[PDB]
Structure formats: C-alpha cells, structure tokens
Amino acid sequence: AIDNGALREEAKGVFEAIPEKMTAIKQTEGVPLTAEKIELGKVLFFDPRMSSSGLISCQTCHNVGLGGVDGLPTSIGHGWQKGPRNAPTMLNAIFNAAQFWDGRAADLAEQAKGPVQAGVSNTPDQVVKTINSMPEYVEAFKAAFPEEADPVTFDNFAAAIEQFEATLITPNSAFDRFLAGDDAAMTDQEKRGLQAFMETGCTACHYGVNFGGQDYHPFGLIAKPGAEVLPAGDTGRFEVTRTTDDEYVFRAAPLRNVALTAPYFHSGVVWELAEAVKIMSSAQIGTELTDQQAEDITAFLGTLTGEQPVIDHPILPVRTGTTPLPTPM
Amino acid sequence: AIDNGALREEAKGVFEAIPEKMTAIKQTPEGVPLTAEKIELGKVLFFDPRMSSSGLISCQTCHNVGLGGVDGLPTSIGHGWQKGPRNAPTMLNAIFNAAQFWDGRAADLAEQAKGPVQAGVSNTPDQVVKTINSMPEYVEAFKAAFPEEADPVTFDNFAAAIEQFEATLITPNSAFDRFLAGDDAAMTDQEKRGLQAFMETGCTACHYGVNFGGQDYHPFGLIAKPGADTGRFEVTRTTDDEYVFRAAPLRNVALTAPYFHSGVVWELAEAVKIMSSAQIGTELTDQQAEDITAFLGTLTGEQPVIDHPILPVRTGTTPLPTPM
Ligand code: HEC
Ligand code: HEC
Ligand code: HEC
Ligand code: HEC
Ligand SMILES: [Ca+2]
Ligand SMILES: [Ca+2]
Numbered sequence: 313a314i315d316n317g318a319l320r321e322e323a324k325g326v327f328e329a330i331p332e333k334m335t336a337i338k339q340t341e342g343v344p345l346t347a348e349k350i351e352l353g354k355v356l357f358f359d360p361r362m363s364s365s366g367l368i369s370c371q372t373c374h375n376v377g378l379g380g381v382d383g384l385p386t387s388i389g390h391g392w393q394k395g396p397r398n399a400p401t402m403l404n405a406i407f408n409a410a411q412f413w414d415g416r417a418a419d420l421a422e423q424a425k426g427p428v429q430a431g432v433s434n435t436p437d438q439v440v441k442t443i444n445s446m447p448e449y450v451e452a453f454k455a456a457f458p459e460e461a462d463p464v465t466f467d468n469f470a471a472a473i474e475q476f477e478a479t480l481i482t483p484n485s486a487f488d489r490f491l492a493g494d495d496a497a498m499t500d501q502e503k504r505g506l507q508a509f510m511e512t513g514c515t516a517c518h519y520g521v522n523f524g525g526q527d528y529h530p531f532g533l534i535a536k537p538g539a540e541v542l543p544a545g546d547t548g549r550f551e552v553t554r555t556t557d558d559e560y561v562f563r564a565a566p567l568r569n570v571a572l573t574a575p576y577f578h579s580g581v582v583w584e585l586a587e588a589v590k591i592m593s594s595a596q597i598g599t600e601l602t603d604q605q606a607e608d609i610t611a612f613l614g615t616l617t618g619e620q621p622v623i624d625h626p627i628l629p630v631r632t633g634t635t636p637l638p639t640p641m
Numbered sequence: 642a643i644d645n646g647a648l649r650e651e652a653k654g655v656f657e658a659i660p661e662k663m664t665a666i667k668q669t670p671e672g673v674p675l676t677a678e679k680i681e682l683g684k685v686l687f688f689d690p691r692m693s694s695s696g697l698i699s700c701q702t703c704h705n706v707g708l709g710g711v712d713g714l715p716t717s718i719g720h721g722w723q724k725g726p727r728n729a730p731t732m733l734n735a736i737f738n739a740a741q742f743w744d745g746r747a748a749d750l751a752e753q754a755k756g757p758v759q760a761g762v763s764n765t766p767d768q769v770v771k772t773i774n775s776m777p778e779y780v781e782a783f784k785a786a787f788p789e790e791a792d793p794v795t796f797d798n799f800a801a802a803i804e805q806f807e808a809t810l811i812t813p814n815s816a817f818d819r820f821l822a823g824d825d826a827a828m829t830d831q832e833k834r835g836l837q838a839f840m841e842t843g844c845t846a847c848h849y850g851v852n853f854g855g856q857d858y859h860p861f862g863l864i865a866k867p868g869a870d871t872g873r874f875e876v877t878r879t880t881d882d883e884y885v886f887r888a889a890p891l892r893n894v895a896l897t898a899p900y901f902h903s904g905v906v907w908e909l910a911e912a913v914k915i916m917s918s919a920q921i922g923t924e925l926t927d928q929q930a931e932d933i934t935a936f937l938g939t940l941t942g943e944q945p946v947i948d949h950p951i952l953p954v955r956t957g958t959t960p961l962p963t964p965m
Contacts, residue, residue: 623949
C-alpha cells in the first residue's frame with residue numbers, strides 16, 4: 313500500500329483545492345469583488361450595533377480567530393432557525409450550495425436566501441435606520457454601491473458582507489498541497505486516512521472543494537440513554553440515525569478546517585474529532601471503519617486545515633445623537 | 642482672542658501630547674522593556690473569549706478596539722472589584738491613568754496596588770492557567786515571552802503580557818496634539834475657543850495631564866434627577882467625601898458614549914453642560930459649553946490598527962465552556 317500518484321489521481325476525481333484568491337462571486341463572470349464592498353462588509357461583520365443588545369456582531373458567533381466559529385455548543389443567530397444550532401464556520405462558506413443545517417426536504421427545496429436573509433421581520437428597517445444614523449456608514453455605502461441612488465438597504469448590507477465572506481477562504485492546507493503535487497505534504501498516516509475516507513464511502517456525502525456542504529441527507533445526530541450523565545469524552549454517547557420516512561434532512565457538514573471548529577454536529581455535543589469520526593462509522597449510512605481506519609481518517613482530517621485569513625480589525629463608524637440606543641433585554 | 646503662541650504655551654503648562662510609541666512601562670527606573678513576544682501574546686489573550694468561563698467573553702468584548710476601546714453600552718460587570726455595574730472605560734491610553742477604578746471609598750482606594758485585571762483575583766487564576774496550559778501554542782508563546790522563568794504560565798504573567806499589549810493601545814496625533822506640536826491650523830477657531838474656555842473655567846482642576854483626567858479622585862459624581870432631555874442628570878457631592886469618583890480621562894471622549902460611571906448620558910454636549918456647576922466651581926455660558934464640546938472632539942487620536950490574532954486551537958483536555 314501507498315502509491316502517491318494513484319492516491320492523488322483518485323483524490324482529484326472527487327475533491328478540489330481551495331483557490332488562492334477569489335476575483336468574482338455568483339458565477340452562474342458573476343459579480344466582481346471590489347475593495348469598497350469587501351471593506352464595508354468587514355466593517356458590517358464586526359459591528360455589534362447591528363444587534364438589538366449592541367453586543368453581538370457576526371464576528372461574535374463566526375469568530376475569525378477561532379476557525380470562523382464561536383467554539384460553543386449552540387446559538388440562535390438567524391430567523392430561519394427552528395431552535396439552537398452549532399454555528400458553522402464562515403471560512404469557505406462561500407462554496408456551500410446547501411446553506412442550512414437542516415429542514416424539511418420539501419421546504420429546503422424551494423428556498424432561495426441563505427441564513428443572513430432567509431425570512432428577514434423588524435430587523436431590516438432597524439438595521440438601515442442604525443446604518444443611516446452614522447455618516448461614515450452612509451459614505452461607505454455610497455462608495456461600495458456607486459450606481460445606486462438608494463444604497464443603504466438590507467440587500468446591500470447582505471451583498472457587502474457576502475463580498476467580505478468571499479475573502480474568508482483558507483487555501484494551502486496540507487491536503488491541498490499534496491493534491492497540487494507535494495508528496496511530503498502529508499504523513500503516511502494522513503495518506504492512509506485519505507485512502508480510507510475515499511474507499512469506505514465518506515465521499516458519497518463529503519466531496520468537492522469543501523468535503524461536504526453541497527446537499528442534505530436523511531441522517532442526524534441523536535443522544536443515547538444517559539448521554540447527559542456521561543463523561544464529555546466517553547464514546548457511544550451519541551449516534552447518527554435515519555430520520556423517519558427520510559422527510560427531514562441535514563446538510564453533510566463541510567469538513568474543511570474541522571480540526572478548528574469543535575464542538576461537532578448540528579447540536580454541538582461532541583467535543584472530540586475522533587469520536588465524531590467513530591459516529592460516522594455506521595451501518596445505517598453505509599460506512600464502517602476499523603479502529604485503524606478511524607484513527608487514520610481522524611489524522612487525515614487535520615490536513616484540511618488551511619491558511620487562516622489575516623484581517624485588520626476595522627475601525628467602526630461613530631454613533632450619533634439619533635443612533636438607536638442598544639436594548640438591555 | 643486667539644494668540645496661537647500664547648494659547649499653545651498655556652496648554653503646555655497643563656497638558657501633554659500622547660507619545661508616538663511606548664518603549665518601556667512601569668518606570669518608577671528604566672521600567673520594564675516592551676517586547677514583541679509579550680505584546681503579541683498579550684494581544685492573543687486580549688481577544689481570547691476562552692479566558693471566560695462562558696467561552697463567549699474576551700477583553701475585546703467590553704473594551705472593543707474598533708469602538709474606541711469600549712463596548713458602547715451603559716454598564717457591565719467585568720472585574721471582581723466593581724461594587725456594581727459600571728460603564729466600561731476605554732483601553733485606549735489607559736496605560737497612562739494613575740487612578741485605576743471608577744469609584745470607591747477614599748480609604749479602600751488608598752490601600753491598593755493592583756488594577757482592575759488583577760484586583761481581588763478567587764478561582765479564576767487556576768482556571769485561566771489550566772486553560773492556557775492545555776494548548777501547546779500558548780505554552781510555546783509564554784516560554785518565548787518569559788524566557789527567564791522556569792514556570793512561565795502564571796496569572797501574574799497573563800496580566801503582564803496583556804499590560805504590554807495595552808501599552809501599544811495609545812492614540813497619538815489627535816488634532817489637539819498636532820496643534821500642541823506647532824500646527825496652528827490643526828484646530829478651528831471654535832475648537833481653540835473651546836480649549837481656552839476649558840482651561841479658564843476650571844475643568845483642568847480635575848481634567849489635566851496627558852489624558853485630561855484619570856489621575857485622581859473626587860467626592861463628586863453623577864446622579865439622576867427624579868421623574869421617570871437635558872435636566873435629567875446632575876453632578877453632586879457624595880454624602881461626606883468618603884465616597885469618591887475618578888476624574889474621567891477625556892481622550893477619545895467623542896468615541897466612547899455613553900458618558901459617566903453609570904453610562905446614562907448619550908450626547909457629549911449634555912455631559913459638558915452637566916459638568917457646568919457651582920458644586921465643582923465651574924460655570925459655563927451657552928457659548929462656552931458649545932465651544933468646549935467642539936474642542937473635546939480634538940482629543941480623538943489615531944486609532945490603533947490591529948491584525949485580529951489567530952487563536953490557539955483547543956485540545957482534548959481544554960476545560961469546557963460553561964452553559965452560563
Ligand atoms: C449567533 C448569535 C450568530 C450570529 C450573531 C450570527 N450567526 Fe450566522 N449562523 C449562526 C448559526 C447558529 C448558524 C446555523 C444556522 C442553521 O440552522 O443552518 C449560522 C449560519 C450562518 C451562515 C451559513 C454558513 C454555511 O456553511 O453556508 C452564514 C454565511 C452566516 N451564518 C453568516 C452570518 C452573518 C453574515 C452574520 C452577521 C449579520 C451572522 N452570521 C451572525 C449563528 C450566528
Ligand atoms: C451521507 C449519508 C454521509 C456520509 C456517508 C458521511 N457523512 Fe459525515 N455527515 C453527514 C451529515 C448529514 C452530518 C451532520 C450531522 C449532524 O447531525 O450534525 C455529517 C457530519 C460529519 C462530521 C462533523 C463535522 C462538523 O462540522 O460537525 C464529521 C467529522 C463527519 N461527518 C465525518 C464523516 C466521515 C469520516 C465519514 C465516512 C466514515 C462520513 N462523515 C460519512 C453525512 C454523511
Ligand atoms: C465586561 C464584561 C468587561 C470585561 C470582559 C473586561 N472588562 Fe475591563 N472593565 C470593565 C468595566 C465595567 C471597568 C470599570 C471597572 C471599574 O468599576 O472601575 C473596566 C476597567 C478596566 C480597566 C481600567 C481602565 C482605565 O480607564 O484605567 C482596564 C485596564 C481593564 N478593564 C482591562 C481589562 C482586561 C485586560 C480585560 C480582559 C482580561 C477586561 N478588562 C475585560 C468591563 C469589562
Ligand atoms: C473636579 C471636581 C472636576 C472638574 C472641575 C470637572 N470634572 Fe469632569 N469629571 C469629573 C469626575 C469625577 C467625572 C466622572 C464622574 C461620574 O459620575 O462618572 C467626570 C466626567 C466628565 C465627563 C464624562 C467623560 C466620560 O468618559 O464618561 C466629561 C465630558 C467631563 N467630565 C467634562 C468636564 C468639563 C467640560 C469640565 C469643565 C466645565 C469638567 N469636566 C470639570 C471631575 C471633574
Ligand atoms: Ca462545529
Ligand atoms: Ca463611556
């Protein structure tokens with residue numbers, strides 16, 4: 313066992329490296345990324361005054377220094393949520409065709425907007441009024457949206473953030489460098505894991521540029537008896553189960569930077585990556601791993617960690633006399 | 642009115658410009674030298690929300706570098722020394738404040754060497770250290786920053802590193818400093834009338850030196866006027882001068898609403914008018930209040946531009962965050 317050329321050839325049939333840099337989005341030549349929109353989006357992403365309490369920004373739950381996530385079990389950040397979910401990483405989110413953790417199959421079907429806009433309530437008006445009250449924001453929106461008479465809209469808020477989101481990509485992980493042609497980029501163990509990941513059927517669901525993130529499956533995590541009275545490391549506390557009549561579905565989690573984004577699953581109840589791998593060894597989904605395979609895939613998944621964005625923290629617009637006051641709650 | 646040379650000369654006897662860059666801290670002689678390794682580790686810690694039991698709150702949360710070094714909210718509770726919720730003061734130029742707390746009884750204030758980060762600091766220290774030790778990138782950074790120490794991951798060192806980072810959170814070259822340094826056109830006529838009124842109406846009794854405050858305490862604080870505008874609050878003497886408040890440092894005041902220890906005033910103009918009162922020996926005309934308000938905007942310096950640190954990755958034995 314262990315031919316690099318064979319392994320690379322096989323991995324190239326199913327995965328793709330993350331690009332070094334994005335130049336446009338929404339190619340279906342798409343929409344040019346521009347410095348002005350990117351910078352406004354960054355400002356918006358870090359501004360806690362876009363929340364009612366004035367403490368919560370996108371950066372709070374999708375923290376760029378912590379793998380694009382908050383490292384906590386669950387939160388509620390978007391109107392489309394039925395309940396609390398683990399925050400997915402913003403890193404590489406631009407590549408995910410499937411935009412939600414879970415839903416009724418037939419409802420996710422005819423659903424266009426992502427989490428930022430889905431459904432979106434009072435918020436848009438409240439966001440715009442907050443933006444309008446600060447002249448530095450108004451000036452920024454006019455520069456980012458030069459062809460727009462009326463540029464401070466919730467759609468434009470969402471558009472500027474999406475442009476910033478497109479810069480939050482993590483090229484040059486060990487796996488990507490292996491893929492490009494560097495044999496020494498991965499260990500023997502990590503290569504054994506790549507091989508096992510591909511042969512045991514994980515790729516049915518975790519494939520393409522993001523190793524997941526593209527489609528939904530009638531399978532999701534549940535607690536076994538006493539899960540909440542058992543050691544947070546303890547094996548066999550949770551397992552995956554097929555939903556009844558396949559009617560409810562979960563997105564196959566995009567596994568890029570997975571080593572950075574514990575805890576795991578839609579409920580954020582698993583803290584060890586090895587345990588998440590063992591849980592995805594299941595007769596029900598059609599994957600079974602030996603102890604060895606589980607160990608090697610775990611080591612493999614560490615190679616999906618890319619170069620983290622280096623981001624200057626923005627200086628936020630000063631509030632003015634009629635900026636809406638934050639709510640205590 | 643407005644002999645520039647004379648006004649500048651007057652300002653220099655009572656205020657100082659913010660230095661371009663700090664080189665050492667704790668000069669009591671050559672102080673402690675600032676180093677790259679310590680500043681860097683201090684920045685990581687400052688942004689790391691895993692330093693709180695909830696895993697959500699970092700120093701950055703309440704002292705937000707993109708928001709003038711503050712959270713912009715009326716009050717919070719961040720340090721075991723607080724008697725009650727207080728408006729979070731700015732991190733910007735805090736290094737220069739000899740007075741360390743919003744308020745307290747004169748005596749408890751008198752006996753005390755440790756600032757907010759360390760005062761009264763419980764089980765926190767062990768929890769913090771355990772958390773840092775569980776991540777090898779932290780242990781490496783601590784070894785690099787404190788090379789002379791066999792046991793470098795301590796709560797003392799956590800605070801010492803953050804203190805070095807804090808020393809880079811300074812804001813030189815405000816319009817007032819540029820005027821002080823010789824640029825007559827750095828401030829408008831109104832702003833200069835404001836400087837002049839600030840100096841002659843007695844504000845400098847308490848708001849003086851490099852930070853326009855931050856240096857001592859006074860038996861005077863903000864209280865609400867009953868009712869459930871403009872006459873909503875007033876400054877008042879404490880019950881007998883045993884209870885005192887720190888003269889707020891006015892650097893970057895334009896950026897750090899809301900105002901006063903309770904964070905109940907939103908408009909700078911109103912905070913100025915509040916500080917006009919015979920109680921403290923100040924009295925402003927309508928025109929002086931307005932000129933002083935414009936002037937206080939010349940205290941807004943160059944905001945630090947900081948690369949957001951990439952945090953150490955947690956491991957199997959990193960303590961889990963608390964539901965809260
Ligand atoms: C916590 C209180 C959050 C706030 C603040 C923000 N987000 Fe979020 N985000 C959060 C959760 C719990 C989820 C999962 C929702 C679900 O049930 O599917 C999300 C999801 C996203 C995504 C999708 C990522 C993907 O993999 O495709 C994106 C792009 C996203 N969120 C962006 C985002 C923006 C731009 C925010 C500021 C306006 C924001 N989030 C805040 C939790 C929280
Ligand atoms: C389709 C039937 C799947 C196959 C085959 C595999 N996975 Fe999977 N994975 C799938 C879903 C629907 C989910 C989310 C489930 C939930 O309840 O949250 C996942 C999730 C993971 C994770 C967690 C990643 C995260 O960010 O939380 C990991 C580490 C993972 N899956 C690994 C993995 C392995 C190694 C597989 C082959 C053995 C595998 N998955 C197969 C869908 C499907
Ligand atoms: C909100 C939950 C906060 C957290 C998180 C942090 N701080 Fe804080 N800080 C907060 C308040 C309400 C106050 C005033 C305390 C008082 O009543 O006097 C402070 C004060 C400071 C200061 C004093 C600054 C000055 O103007 O001289 C400093 C230097 C400071 N705090 C530092 C600091 C550090 C390093 C933090 C992370 C360890 C941190 N604060 C968190 C509110 C909150
Ligand atoms: C000594 C008795 C003082 C004199 C004279 C002046 N100020 Fe003051 N100031 C003082 C204290 C003790 C405080 C905080 C009190 C509290 O309850 O919080 C302040 C605060 C301010 C502020 C608010 C700044 C903030 O960051 O919250 C401003 C804008 C201010 N002071 C301005 C000001 C002016 C214009 C003065 C001359 C007319 C003046 N102060 C005098 C103490 C004292
Ligand atoms: Ca996660
Ligand atoms: Ca304030």
